[PDB]
Every structure is written in structure tokens, then in C-alpha cells.
From a paper:
BMs are assembled from a toolkit of proteins that includes a collagen IV scaffold as a principal component. This scaffold confers structural integrity to tissues, binds integrins for cell adhesion and signaling, binds bone morphogenic proteins for signaling gradients during tissue development, and tethers a diverse assortment of molecules, including laminins, proteoglycans, and growth factors, which harbor a plethora of functions. Second, two protomers oligomerize via their trimeric noncollagenous (NC1) domains forming an NC1 hexamer at the junction, and four protomers oligomerize via the 7S domain forming a tetrameric structure. In protomer oligomerization, the interaction between trimeric NC1 domains is a chloride-dependent event.
Thus, native C41–C42 connections can be supplemented with similar artificial connections between C42 and C41 of adjacent domains to generate a single-chain α121 NC1 trimer (sc121 NC1 trimer) combining six C4 sub-domains. To determine the number and positions of Cl− ions involved into stabilization of the NC1 hexamer, here we purposely purified and crystallized the sc121 NC1-trimer in the presence of high chloride concentration to mimic natural extracellular Cl− content. Ultimately, it was crystallized in space group P41212 with a single polypeptide chain per asymmetric unit. Here, the hexamer is formed by two sc121 NC1-trimers related by a crystal 2-fold rotation symmetry. The overall atomic structure is identical to the previously reported structures for human and bovine NC1 domains isolated from tissues. All C4–C4 linkers, native and artificial, are well-structured and are related by a pseudo-hexagonal symmetry. Analysis of the hexamer formed from sc121 NC1-trimers revealed a set of 12 Cl− ions at the trimer–trimer interface. Collectively, all 12 Cl− at the trimer–trimer interface have well-defined and comparable electron density and B-factor values in the range from 23 to 27 Å2, like atoms of nearby residues. Together, the 12 ions form a chloride ring at the hexamer interface. Analysis of the solvent-accessible surface of the trimer and the hexamer shows that group 1 chloride ions are solvent-accessible in the trimer only, but group 2 ions remain solvent-exposed in the assembled hexamer. Group 1 ions induce hexamer assembly, and group 2 ions stabilize the hexamer structure.
Residue numbers in the entry:
A (entry chain A), B (entry chain A): 4 to 676
Write the structure that this text describes.
């Protein structure tokens, strides 16, 4: 069916594909990139973390004036690293001296899906019954470096299970060709939690060389038939698995971690959002000097919550339990997806598809600072059965307490009374019994196969590619920005294809159970068409917006689909056993207002746009206006010569007529069945 | 008395000192720097914006392991620029080709204080009666570039009045030696506002070459005897000036602007916080292509507010007026300062000092996103007569509406029952009649002369320097971090010298009139002593914190004091007419948790620390713990060879025994009287 597993050696040698899997290609271990000071990661369990060609600057950026710049500002790349020591000078490494520092990786095709399980103890967690073992490791969850930017791993992804513990598991590289370790490069790991300690104030620990792994959770990567379904009860009782679905485990509903004031979220539809053991501080962090700190600074955790009444002051220890939502992870015979109506009407499941539950369209959230995160709209995690203005609670780390604070926001897709296009939303403030008719509805449904999403980048619906069948058409949503926090929908997922357009397709709700729609200064971003910008350069409003918005198709596929990238001007061939759906250009990330943005998974078809555009997306506002602004940046994978991988990038500024000469090419492929 | 004015030519030629002033030195126009992705600006009206030696990397950073790195990561510097065109290649500029792009400046000594006034029309505002004119210009307020980081000008500073309008008034440089213009380099200007339009929804305008200056406010820089006192009524009536103080103007209480999701604040004790004409969008912005946008995106403004009752929905147009606090700017015979008690007791004014009012210690604020700002604790702007859990209102730009949202926080210095040292704060949640006894009190008092603040960086009180007299001693506060936003107290100001220490010297209050003290995950930062870090490297608690905290003295001076910096290993001589108070090392900025931080004004004695330390400050938490963490970074001005100013910086990594070889030296000087 085309499942993939990616393995990282954390040495200069290629890792072997785990028993029962077969090699597709090898590469270098890409952790994340940082462009215009915004980080965008690649999950280490996915093929996008494995790049065939290294470079300290593997991407470039383009502006709306059709000018692209390569290695010509101040951007970063980050790579998993080897045991190689820092040179005694502690000065940045350049050229071929970089090579001994970069981890290698393997992309392998598995016969069945692959996941990680975590013990939250020093013991190895066993694989689920009937699942086969691929490797064991240490629970790696997130990381931060320059600017305290960073990214993290999904806790059910193999990428959260590193086979070698390192206080310094990654190295920082710069567009100018330098790489080094820096004292603020932090690695975050799941900590060991005793069941008896779950609802006690954490005992802080400062750990040094020789005792570090004593507090690091262990993991095992496992392969098994079927798929995973995750349910969150939003109550203090574990949910029941649907009829016929064996339960793997129950736990506590984890929404996100905050380390160094940087959120790292778990998708509520994935098993990483269901943690078996609760703590107000379930992780620790290490600096590169082999010193780790558990519950010894000012970090926090966030959990989906129950209807337990708002406390007057923070709750401590065992008073926390009634507040924490519970979850169950279940073995499913097919992949569950969410469908959203953007309407008062509940959306029906497609004909023949088994329905699992009905809910409300939960999109994103913010709390302390402007940190937060959001859900994938094709994930069941975006469909909460119970609407709640405040669906999560904050747990303040080493304090051992949890509380509701006034800056907690939830964001929900809105109902839209128009059949499909809302260019001029009307602001409103909603309370009490007037809220729910403005919250989009959803249903979670079991799909018979797989989904491929395609974007025309024109006003015309795209055709479904060969071997796939249309499910629905819509508009190309790139990301949203709520309360100054950006949240994307991967362009390879059905969440980037919305049946209804609005310049403001969401609203937000506060601790006082008041919701505000199109009343503040929030944004939506959409892939756009070749429609020329107006000569006036003034914002576009209302019905005049329609010619600018790209259309999309969501299609049913008989097998899995992926993107591969050449990092050259040549088209990369599809892997053996895979056939071609389309070709395009390697699209990595983007920023716009406030330098916020999002990006694509490099193994996702969403990182392979069929039409190169220096300005591939348009910015819209709750005010009912859209425009192209001069700070809209698109980032693409750069072309790299194998012989020059480790040499200093040669900076280049490209103009119209030579843009696509330095843009990596890609192909989208589906496993032949 | 030693007043200074700084002028920027915006060309390659030295500007002339304005009539009635005399030249001290010339240099290059430094706008801001960015280190570890955090921006720190120098107000263009101050001598710290005028650096004798240019470099694309004029600073270095040091970590707690006594290792310093120069031009060896990925940092930035920004400079006011000339009319020089971009090269046709649009590729980064290097080497001597940079020189034609950098503005020159002059630092001049004035016989009296200097300010800017703004018309908010296309007409030149007249100088106040009895004030003499120095130059006229255009109202320049803030700017953003890479990462949408940036900084801005105080609206009563000459730095807010640029003599030449430019859509692209500054250029971006990098540690690697490159400089260029980028499409996201935004300049923000005060807009023209008709009195009849003040409380109407803004009319958006997209402006192109040939009509840009039609919407740009004009300004005049003026010199006059005496000082300025600013009062905010916190009501819809203008405050009366104190007896004997002539009123210059009345206006509306401006707290901050938000452009590109980056706050730029006005000090509530300075005349820039009193804007004569209100608008929900009082500024516009330009990109470097000579295209400007007024009320055409998603920016906002924030104002001090009244007791007008919380509206159920946003208020529009003329319903806004009852909500906006009013202000008056008054001519004062001496400089008013705030003194804070950190106690239930109201602090008395020093003997002989005229008292102006009594209030509560207002420290900082956050609202949309995590943006916000704060007050200087020696400024009367930190002493609000009326405590308010929500002392400001948000105005949503081009919507033309204002509202109170649930994520608005105010932060206040706390009362502390200990005589001077609180190492273990006890968390509490406060409501209704139990709040006010926990809010520090203040009094605003007219000082007979000037103030100099000195830090011992030891547990011993420093001596007041020659020619000054002790006023009080305290502890060295570097900055605070509330709701993930950092807010500093310049080390050359009395606000960095607090009579009482706490790991959590503040609390925050929410829209529901509930205050939370030491209950979440906030921070305070203090200059520290030579006390060794514990071998255990574990956090320090309670009374054990005392040996680590630096002491300070606030002293009365007969004249103004400044810092000068050599950018070499040699001590810079005091200017002619000025005598030496102490020598030290050029200290620019710092970051710690979350890569947040603050910095010093380079003309302030706070940028001249007498003891160089790679780890000059310690991090404390509301939990009652303090520690040195590996991501604590100190940034210092680097040494620069005049012949190599425009050449590529040579990167250097320095170890113990050679740290001070690349650290600029400074001297603190007082005008002889
Ligand atoms: Cl770069
Ligand atoms: Cl470092
Ligand atoms: Cl912690
Ligand atoms: Cl709160
Ligand atoms: Cl909005
Ligand atoms: Cl723009
Ligand atoms: Cl650098
Ligand atoms: Cl650009
Ligand atoms: Cl605007
Ligand atoms: Cl709100
Ligand atoms: Cl706290
Ligand atoms: Cl640390």
C-alpha cells in the first residue's frame, strides 16, 4: 500500500532498513530550516527529514516582484548530528570539515503502518500485541535553538524515538556556509513519571553526565496491520473504542508542550495526543554540555479539559484529575477523516462510509504569550463532539498546578450562509445561546482507501490525477493567522481544500464564553491564480476576490501518495513500484504578515506545486479585503550540485527569466497496486 | 548643563550641528541591531544612534562558559541610509561598496533641552512659544525588517523627525559582511488626520510615487528652557497642568502602535505619549518600492482608557470618545521622577522635593499576540493615579472600532512585606477589595538636579562617583518577563535600582478584575555578583539567593551624564567640558529564557558596566528559584579598526584570557559646571 518509515543513524554511515522493510534511498538527516526568522520542521519519522543532498542552505526565497535570492540574507538549516566532537577552537566548521558532523538516513517502504510507543519509564515499552518491533530508543519530543525557534516530533511517529540519546543531537548551519553547536541548542525529551507521582508536584532534578538517561523515557518503534483511531472524551472517563476496534491504550488528552516559550503540539487525531501517564511537567530538557533539567525552570503543558467548573484559584495535585480529558487509542480497519460543512447543517459522510461521531470544527488555539497551535482539518482531532469556548487547561510545570487564565482562546471554523463564497464577512459578537449556530459542524467518517489533494492554482477545478476519483472540489486554503499566530493546512491534505471561501473562515471564543467573529485583526491565506494584481495595487474586496482564489480537488486514491525532490533542474523519478501523478516545483514554506507563516511536509504532495509562482498565495483579512503585499515570501528547495554539497553556497540573486533555473523539481507518486 | 541633540544627514556627508549647538563628534547612523533574533534599537535623537566606527557586525556575544563569539552566528545590524540606488543586480553589497549607502550623523551639545512636535497634517507645526527652531521634517515613528523585528522613535524625540522622507530610509547588514534592501523593510510614519475625521472610520489609501508625502505628517525640532511634565487624566477630560506650569498642548493618551504585529510604545511620562489628534489608525507604512498603505492592512493602536463601562461589542466612531484618556504636556522648572515603595506605604518625596501626585506602580502590559510594552520606573508614566485592572483599550485600525478583549493584561509592581529581600514569594489570586494592598505605591516628585545610577556588581553598595551625592541604595534589576514578553529598565536609570528584591516583584491583572501573583511562569532578571555558581548547578532558592544579587546606588548629580564608547581596547576620552565618573566595558543587550531580552541606550551610563562578565546577570522565577542557564547571552560592542570598517568582519571565537581583547571600552562622563 506504500507505507514508509524513515530511520536516522546519527552517524556518518547509512542506517540499515529495519527487518521487514526495503530501502528506497539514503540521505542526510534534515531537522528543520529557518527562513526570515521562522522555523519550519520536518518530522523525523517522515521521508521529508531525509534529503539526498546536504547543503548549509538547501532553500531560497522569492518576493512578489519576481526576484529570488539564494544564500543572500541570513537564514539557517539544522541537521541531526553525529558523535563528532566540537573542535578545540569551538569556532564554526566550514567546507568538507562539516561532513563528519551530519547524520545519515534511510527511507524505507514498509508493508504496514509504523508507530512509536513510549514507556515514560526507564523500561522499554512493549509493542502492541500483534505488532512487530523495528527498533528501540529514547523519547525525543522537541528542540529549540537560535531565537528559541524550533520544532518537534509527533509522539506516535518513529521520529519521536531516537536510537541514541544525545544532549546535543543536532547542529546549526548558516547560509554563509558555517555550522556549529551553540549553548542555547536545547533538546527536549519525555521524562520518567511514576504512576504514584502523576498528580503530585514534580520533584525538580538537575542532572549531569553519568545520570542523564536515568530520567529519560524509552520507546519502541513497531509495525502492524490496520490503522489507528484516537478518541478524546472531553470528560474524566476514558472513551470507549468503536464496536469492533481493539483498544491499544487509554490515557490523558495532551494538546501541547511549551518549552523555552515555544509551543510544540500533538495532533488530536494522532496517538501522540494520548499520553498514558499525566504530569504537569512530562518532559525535561538538555543543553549541549551534558546537563539536563527536569521541572527546574519555567516551562508548561496544556491538556484538553472537561466540564469541571472554573476554579477560583489554580488546582493542585489530586484536585487536577477532574479537569483532564481522557482518551483511547483504537485499532481501526480504515483511516478515519473529518469532513466540515462550514454550515449550520451537519455534513453527511460520503456514501458507504462508516460514521464515527459528529461534532464542531475545532481549528486552533492560543494561550500564554502568543503560543498555541492547531488541528489538521482532515484529522478527527479537528472534530470535537462538545463545543467549548475554553476546551483546554494550562498546567504550570514545576508548580504542579493547573488553571484557566483569561488569555486562552479557542478558534473554530464558522458557518457561512453563502453557498460557497463570502468576500465581505459581517462582524459580530456572540454570547450564550446565540453561539452554536455560528460554529461549523463536522462528522468523522471511515474512508475506504486514501485521499489525494490537488490544487489548480487557477479559477478552474483541477482534474483528479490518473487512477483516482473525485470526492469534492473547493478553494485552496494555505493557512490562517489568529491572534497573531499562524496555523497551516498542509497542501497535500484535504484540510487545504475548503468547500466555502471566506476572507475570515473562523472565529475565536474566550474564557467568558463570548465569541468574536471578524471583529479584530486576523487573517486568512489562500493559494492564488494568475489573475494580475490590480494596477491600483489597492486591496480587493467582496465578489472581486473570486478570480484570485485557487481551486482544488480531493480525490479517492487506491494507495498512498508521496512527493520526491531532485534538488536539481531534472525531474526526480518515482520510486520503484510507484507511478507518477504529476510533476512540479519544490515548495517548502512561506511568510507574510508579521513574518508568520507555515510550510509543507517534503514527503507530502503539498510540497510539489505544479506551477512555479514567486507569489503563489494571497493575503486576506477579517475586514473583507485581500491583497499581495511586498513582504509575502515563498521558499523553495534550491538546486545543489553533489560535488559542492559541503562547500560554501554561492549566493545568487535571480530575476524573471532565470527563476526556475535554481528551483528544485519534484514528482508526486502513488504506490502501484 | 549637558543636553545633547543628534542629527542624521541621510547622506554620505556630515550633517551640520543646528544653530545654537556645537559639535562633539561625527559618526554613522545606527538604527538597530538584531542578536539571537531579537532587535534592540537606538533612538535616533540620542547619541547612541551615532557610532564613530561602522561595521556590518559592531557587536559580539558571550555565554556563561566564558566563550565569546564575534561574527560567528547569524546576526544583523541596521543603519539609516542615503539616496544611493540599489545596484541593478539587486545582489547584496559588500566591502567598500557599502560606504555610499550609510548615513552620517553629528552629536551636538545644546544649551537647553530639545524636542520634536508633530502636526499630523501636511503643514509644519510651529515650535512652542519661546522655543527656537532647529530643523523641520517628516514624522518617523517605527520600522520593521527581518522576522518583522524592529524598533521605533519616541514621538517627542528629535529622532522622530527625519529631514528627508524616504520610503526606504534604512539598509540591512549581516555579520557575514553583506548589506542590502529587502522587500519587507517597512517604514512607519505618522499620518495626516483631519480634526473632523478623528472619530470616523479611517478612509484607506494606497499611495504611489508622486503622492506619498500627501499623507505624511510633518514635524519641527525645537529647543527651549526648562523641562516637560506629562499628565494622563485617565478620564475623558484633559488634566490641568500643575500650578505655575504653562500648558504646551492637550491630547489623547497614546500607549502603543502595533505595525506588522510588532509593538512600538511611547513612555507615558514623555510628551510622545500625548497625541494631539486621535485616530484608530494614526500611522501609515511604506515598503521600499515607493508604495505606502494607510489603514489598508491589519494594524492597530492602543490608548490609555477611562472608567467608561465595558461595552458589549466594539464601539465605533463617536462612541469611542468616552473611552479615551486625555493628557496635557506642561512646561516644568525641573525634572519630575517617580519613586516606588514596593510596599503598602506610600513613598515620601525626598526632603525639599515638590510632590505632584500619588499613584500605583504601573510596570508593563500585553494584549494582542504577546505584544505590549512597559514603563520606565523612574518615569512619571509608571505612576498612574488610578489603579485599573485594564487601564488601556485596543483600537482595531482600519475597522475604526475599539474594544476590550480578554487577553489584555496589566502588570504592576507588588507590595512586599519583607524589609528588603523576598526570595520565596507565595502565590495568590486576588479579587475585588483584596487587590489594592498588593499594588506598590508611588509618588511623583520634582528633583532639584539630575540622577546617576551606578551598579557595584557585588553584594556591597557602590560609592556615588565624584561630585554626586547618595539618594538611596538598592538591588540591580535588569529586566522582567511577563506573559512571555520582556521589559527592561535601562541600567543608567533609577528604575534599574529597586529598594526591595523579589524573584517575582510584580503581578498581573485581567479583564475580569482578577490579579494573579507568582502563580504562572514569569521571570525577573538581575545583575549578579562574582558569587560562584553552585557545583550542583541546581536552582538557588530563598535566602540563598542574596549573595548573587548586585547592589546599586542612585545619586544626585549637578549636571547631565553620558557614556562614550571607543570601539577599541583604549579608553575613550570624555568630551571637552565633561569630566570622568567611571570607566568600563560597552554593554549593548542580552537574551535569556525564550530568547527574550532587552538592552541599553549607548549614550546611557547603563551601557558602561565597570566589570566585564560573560555572565553578568541571573535569571529568577515566580517559583522562588534563580539560576544561570546555558542560553543566557550578553552582547557587547566589538572592537573595530578604522581601516577595516567596511571590510568583511573576521569571525573570532575567544576563550578565557582573551575575552576583553575584543570588547569595546567606555567612559561615563558628566558635564562640568
Ligand atoms: Cl542566507
Ligand atoms: Cl554559544
Ligand atoms: Cl520547568
Ligand atoms: Cl488570568
Ligand atoms: Cl478579524
Ligand atoms: Cl507592502
Ligand atoms: Cl554573525
Ligand atoms: Cl526581498
Ligand atoms: Cl491597517
Ligand atoms: Cl476576547
Ligand atoms: Cl510566576
Ligand atoms: Cl540550560
Amino acid at each position: 500500500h506504500g507505507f514508509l518509515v524513515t530511520r536516522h543513524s546519527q552517524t556518518i554511515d547509512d542506517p540499515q532498513c529495519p527487518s521487514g522493510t526495503k530501502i528506497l534511498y539514503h540521505g542526510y538527516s534534515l531537522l528543520y530550516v529557518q527562513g526570515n526568522e521562522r522555523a519550519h520542521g520536518q518530522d523525523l519519522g517522515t521521508a521529508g527529514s531525509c534529503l539526498r543532498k546536504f547543503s548549509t542552505m538547501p532553500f531560497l526565497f522569492c518576493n512578489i516582484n519576481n526576484v529570488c535570492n539564494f544564500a543572500s540574507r541570513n537564514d539557517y538549516s539544522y541537521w541531526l548530528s553525529t558523535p563528532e566532537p566540537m573542535p578545540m577552537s569551538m569556532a564554526p566548521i566550514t567546507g568538507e570539515n562539516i561532513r563528519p558532523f551530519i547524520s545519515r538516513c534511510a527511507v524505507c517502504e514498509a508493508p504496514a503502518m509504523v508507530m512509536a510507543v513510549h514507556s515514560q519509564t526507564i523500561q522499554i515499552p512493549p509493542c502492541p500485541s500483534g505488532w512487530s518491533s523495528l527498533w528501540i530508543g529514547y523519547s525525543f519530543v522537541m528542540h529549540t535553538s537560535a531565537g528559541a525557534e524550533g520544532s518537534g516530533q509527533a509522539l506516535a511517529s518513529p521520529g519521536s524515538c531516537l536510537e541514541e540519546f544525545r544532549s546535543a543531537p543536532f547542529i546549526e548551519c548558516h547560509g554563509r556556509g558555517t555550522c556549529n553547536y551553540y549553548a542555547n541548542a536545547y533538546s527536549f525529551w519525555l521524562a520518567t513519571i511514576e504512576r504514584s507521582e502523576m498528580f503530585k508536584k514534580p520533584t525538580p532534578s538537575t542532572l549531569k553526565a553519568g545520570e542523564l538517561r536515568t530520567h529519560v523515557s524509552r520507546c519502541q518503534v513497531c509495525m502492524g496491520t490496520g490503522y489507528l483511531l484516537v478518541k478524546h472524551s472531553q470528560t474524566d472517563q476514558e472513551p470507549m473504542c468503536p464496536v469492533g476496534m481493539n483498544k491499544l491504550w487509554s490515557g490523558y488528552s495532551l494538546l501541547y508542550f511549551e518549552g523555552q516559550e515555544k509551543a510544540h503540539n500533538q495532533d488530536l487525531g494522532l496517538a501522540g495526543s494520548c499520553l498514558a501517564r499525566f504530569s504537569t511537567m512530562p518532559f525535561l530538557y538538555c543543553n549541549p554540555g551534558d546537563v539536563c533539567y527536569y521541572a527546574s525552570r519555567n516551562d508548561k503543558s496544556y491538556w484538553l479539559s472537561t466540564t469541571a467548573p472554573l476554579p477560583m484559584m489554580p488546582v493542585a495535585e489530586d484536585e487536577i484529575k477532574p479537569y483532564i480529558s481522557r482518551c483511547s487509542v483504537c485499532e481501526a480497519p480504515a483511516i478515519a477523516i473529518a469532513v466540515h460543512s462550514q454550515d449550520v447543517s451537519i455534513p453527511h459522510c460520503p456514501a458507504g462510509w462508516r460514521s464515527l461521531w459528529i461534532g464542531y470544527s475545532f481549528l486552533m488555539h492560543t494561550a500564554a504569550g502568543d503560543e498555541g497551535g492547531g488541528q489538521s482539518l482532515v484529522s478527527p482531532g479537528s472534530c470535537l463532539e462538545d463545543f467549548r469556548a475554553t476546551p483546554f487547561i494550562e498546567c504550570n510545570g514545576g508548580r504542579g498546578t493547573c488553571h484557566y487564565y483569561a488569555n486562552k482562546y479557542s478558534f473554530w471554523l464558522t458557518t457561512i450562509p453563502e453557498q460557497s463564497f463570502q468576500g465581505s464577512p459581517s462582524a459580530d459578537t456572540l454570547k450564550a445561546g446565540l453561539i452554536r449556530t455560528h460554529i461549523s459542524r463536522c462528522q468523522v467518517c471511515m474512508a475506504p482507501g486514501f485521499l489525494v489533494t490537488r490544487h489548480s492554482q487557477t479559477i478552474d477545478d483541477p482534474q483528479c490525477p490518473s487512477g483516482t476519483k473525485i470526492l469534492y472540489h473547493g478553494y485552496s486554503l494555505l493557512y490562517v493567522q489568529g491572534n497573531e499566530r499562524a496555523h497551516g493546512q498542509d497542501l497535500g491534505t484535504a484540510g487545504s481544500c475548503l468547500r466555502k471561501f471566506s476572507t475570515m473562515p473562523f472565529l475565536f471564543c474566550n474564557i467568558n464564553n463570548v465569541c468574536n467573529f471578524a471583529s479584530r485583526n486576523d487573517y486568512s491565506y489562500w493559494l492564488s491564480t494568475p489573475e494580475p494584481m490590480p494596477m491600483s495595487m489597492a486591496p480587493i474586496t467582496g465578489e472581486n476576490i473570486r478570480p484570485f482564489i485557487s481551486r482544488c480537488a480531493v480525490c479517492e486514491a487506491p494507495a498512498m501518495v508521496m512527493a520526491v525532490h531532485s534538488q536539481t533542474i531534472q525531474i526526480p523519478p518515482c520510486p520503484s513500484g510507484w507511478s507518477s501523478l504529476w510533476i512540479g516545483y519544490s515548495f517548502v514554506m512561506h511568510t507574510s504578515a508579521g513574518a508568520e507563516g507555515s510550510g509543507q511536509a517534503l514527503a507530502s504532495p503539498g510540497s510539489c506545486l505544479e506551477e512555479f509562482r514567486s507569489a503563489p498565495f494571497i493575503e486576506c483579512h477579517g475586514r473583507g479585503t485581500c491583497n499581495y503585499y511586498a513582504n509575502a515570501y515563498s521558499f523553495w528547495l534550491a538546486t545543489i550540485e553533489r560535488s559542492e554539497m559541503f562547500k560554501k553556497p554561492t549566493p545568487s540573486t535571480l530575476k524573471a527569466g532565470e527563476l526556475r533555473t535554481h528551483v528544485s523539481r519534484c514528482q508526486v507518486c502513488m504506490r502501484r497496486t
